[PDB]
Amino acid sequence: DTYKLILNGXSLKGETTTEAVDAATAEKVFKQYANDNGVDGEWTYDDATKTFTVTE
């Protein structure tokens, strides 16, 4: 499936996607996307829309 990440770094906001076989794999890829851009913080996941958020 396609998973989405909404990144909120404050002034900087990102929206990306990844194809993954499951949510756990998408999550790991999204975790590395977030920290590559200096965003470490609070995570949420909505399985109904396959949408993660990470907020500084």
Author numbering: 1 to 56
The authors write:
With the decreasing helix propensity of amino acids in the order Ala > Ser > Val, we noted an increase in both d and θ between COi+1 → COi+2, suggesting a gradual weakening of the n → π* interaction at the i + 2 residue. Thus, to obtain a quantitative estimate of the n → π* interaction energy (En→π*) at the i + 2 residue in 2, 3, and 4, we resorted to NBO analysis, which clearly indicated a decreasing En→π* in the order 2 > 3 > 4. We were surprised to note a very good correlation between the TM of these proteins and En→π* between COi+1 → COi+2, in the absence of the stabilizing COi⋯HNi+3 hydrogen bond.
Thus, we chose to engineer the loop L1 of the 56-residue immunoglobulin-binding domain B1 of the streptococcal protein G (GB1).35–38 The solvent exposed loop L1 in wild type GB1 is a type-I β-turn with lysine at the i + 1 position and threonine at the i + 2 position that lacks a COi+1 → COi+2 n → π* interaction. However, to have a better control over the turn conformation, we decided to introduce a type-II′ β-turn. Gratifyingly, the thermal denaturation of the GB1 proteins shows a good correlation between their stability and the strength of an n → π* interaction at the β-turn.
